[PDB]
Each structure stands twice: as structure tokens, then as C-alpha cells.
Structure 1
Amino acid sequence: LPPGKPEIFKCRSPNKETFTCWWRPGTDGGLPTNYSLTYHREGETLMHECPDYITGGPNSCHFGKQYTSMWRTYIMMVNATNQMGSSFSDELYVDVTYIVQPDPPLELAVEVKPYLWIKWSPPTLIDLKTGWFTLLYEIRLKPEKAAEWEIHFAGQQTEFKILSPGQKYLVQVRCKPDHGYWSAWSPATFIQIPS
């Protein structure tokens, strides 16, 4: 009848300016009517509550840029509660600096002139121009029944070029920050090379 010890199982920042964490209802216990996320930051005694339970969706806390600092630990807890009782997640120690994983890149186009010409864009709402964010890219591609993919690292460039038969290629691009996590591959683009 009472919950259900919860877990904050991941946090992620897509751009060092905001971030979001996520929790799972607990290892068997009752149906939690309510959830609560509280935290403090180092260099501060003051106890906070989640600023925003909506935008991240189901079982999530979203920290807008107004509540997001780089280089400062966040000590976090979720409370799960019933008419019957309650339980507290373990404290989670988390630092925005080390949970950066951007969205995938946008508008992957492929043109076919002796070479093919791949072009993409940053995920939106990264701030690249200013120096704040630094985004490395990577490209994979494969004929249609190939066992293994071919990966070409492309650094900070938003374009790249390969030298190949008369064949159909699936191509994908992903991106990571200078230090952090690879985005997921973007959706595939398709290109036929003539003779």
C-alpha cells in the first residue's frame, strides 16, 4: 500500500543551458498519488523544489536556464507519496558539466557532385557561435546489405566529402560535444550514385 522506493535514473543537458532528470516509480509498492523532487546546490543551504514538472513530461524534472548552473553539484531527491505512506529516492549527486548529450543534427542533405557532398545543421538551440558550446560531428554510411558501416569523423565541420560504385547509400550523422555524449544518429538519408 505505500510506494515504492523511487530512482532518479538519468539526467541530461542538451546544451549546457537547461537540463532534465527522470525517475521511475519504485520497486514494488503502492500506486503513488503524488511525486516530489527537491534538491540543493553546493555553496548553499537553501532547499529547492523542482521548478517544472511539465515540459519534460511523465516523472521528470526540467530545470530551465534560470535554474541551471555549470560547475556546481546538485544534490537531489524524489519523494513518492500515498494516503498510506511515502518513500525517498537515494540522493543523486549530479553536475551539469558531465551530463551533456545533444539532440541529433538537423537537415542532413546528400548531393552527388568526383564526389558526394554531405551537409547538415546543428541541433537547434545550441549556442555555437559564441564559443559556449563546441560540437563535433561524425558520419556513417552503408550500402544496403552491408555487414558493417563506414564511419568518417568530420570535426567541427558542417559538411564533408567521400570518394566511393553505382549504388544506394543509407547515410546518418551524429554529434557530440567537445566533452560529453554522442547524440543519437539522425534519421537516415538516401542517395543513389549513377555511373
Structure 2
Amino acid sequence: MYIVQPDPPLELAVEVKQPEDRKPYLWIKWSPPTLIDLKTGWFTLLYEIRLKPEKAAEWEIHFAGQQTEFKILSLHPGQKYLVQVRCKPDHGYWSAWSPATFIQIPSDFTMND
């Protein structure tokens, strides 16, 4: 029962979505770990996303759950954000982070046109 690190949610794709009607948001989506497929039985793989802008001294943790995509509404146009998501496989629980992804929120985030 040694805690090994098989596959974290890799291919962390971060996109800024600006809807015409809805509010502009950061759309974070990741790829589920290869093999296993924690779909059978009530043992689903939950994901947690932590993010914060450059001038943020503290991290904002947002637990997504079973869904493999998360949206951030509280964003500052024209600022750097750091994002991380990780899952907890049956034989490999986590207590630390690693995949720090750098995403730039465009100044065009707000429709100042």
C-alpha cells in the first residue's frame, strides 16, 4: 500500500471564454489519467483546482468534484494567473502540488470596446 504516483490530470488546458450573453470566465479542463477508469462502482475520481493571480499572496482552492472542467469568474483583465489541478487515485492519495500552469488573462477580458 505504498503511495505511488501513477497519472495526474495531465494536458492541463486553460482557456479564456468570453460569451456574448454570459459573463467571461476562465475555462480549465484537464485530461483524466490513462487506464483504470474510475467509472465503475461508486469510487469516482474527484479533482481539486487551486488558482490565484500574480498579486495574490494566498491560494484559492476550488474543489470541482467529479466534473473534469472548472470555471473561474473572479478574474482580473490583463493579469497572470497560476492554476493547478490534481486527482486522488485509489492507491495514490496526494497532499502536495506540482503542475503549476501559467495562464495570462487578456486585457480584452472585459468588453471595453
Give me the whole-angstrom Cα distance separating, in 2, the residues matched to 1:184 and 1:131: 27
Give me the whole-angstrom Cα distance separating, in 2, the residues matched to 1:183 and 1:141: 16
Give the aligned CA root-mean-square deviation in angstroms: 2.9
Give me the whole-angstrom Cα distance separating, in 2, the residues matched to 1:129 and 1:192: 33
Displaced runs of 4 or more, over 4 A: 98-102, 177-180
Determine if contact 1:143/1:168 at 8 Å carries over to the other structure: yes
Query: Are 1:158 and 2:68 an aligned pair?
Result: yes
Deviation of 1:182 (Å): 2.4
Give me the whole-angstrom Cα distance separating, in 1, the residues matched to 2:5 and 2:93: 5
Deviation of 1:125 (Å): 2.0
Deviation of 1:172 (Å): 0.7
Deviation of 1:103 (Å): 3.2
Give me the whole-angstrom Cα distance separating, in 2, the residues matched to 1:183 and 1:106: 17
Deviation of 1:166 (Å): 2.0
Identity %: 100
Determine if contact 1:104/1:185 at 8 Å carries over to the other structure: no
Instruction: Report Cα offsets for 1:92-128 as digits up to 9, x if no partner.
Output: xxxxxx9586532111100009111000112212222
Give me the whole-angstrom Cα distance separating, in 2, the residues matched to 1:151 and 1:133: 22
Q: Quick one: structure 1 residues 100 and 156, their matched pair in 2 at CA, closer, same or farther if it must change by over 3 Å?
A: farther
Determine if contact 2:9/2:32 at 8 Å carries over to the other structure: yes
Q: Which residue of 2 aligns with 1:43?
A: none
Structure of higher RCO (CA pairs closer than 8 Å, 6+ residues apart) = 2
Give me the whole-angstrom Cα distance separating, in 1, the residues matched to 2:27 and 2:11: 13
Q: Which residue of 2 aligns with 1:144?
A: 54
Structure 2 gap ranges (5+):
17-22, 108-113
Higher strand share: 1
TM-score (norm 2): 0.69
Q: Quick one: structure 1 residues 132 and 163, their matched pair in 2 at CA, closer, same or farther if it must change by over 3 Å?
A: closer
Give me the whole-angstrom Cα distance separating, in 2, the residues matched to 1:171 and 1:189: 5
Give me the whole-angstrom Cα distance separating, in 1, the residues matched to 2:90 and 2:47: 10
Larger radius of gyration: 1
How many residues are matched?
98
Determine if contact 1:103/1:184 at 8 Å carries over to the other structure: no
Give me the whole-angstrom Cα distance separating, in 2, the residues matched to 1:123 and 1:184: 17
* SS of match in other structure, 2:95: coil
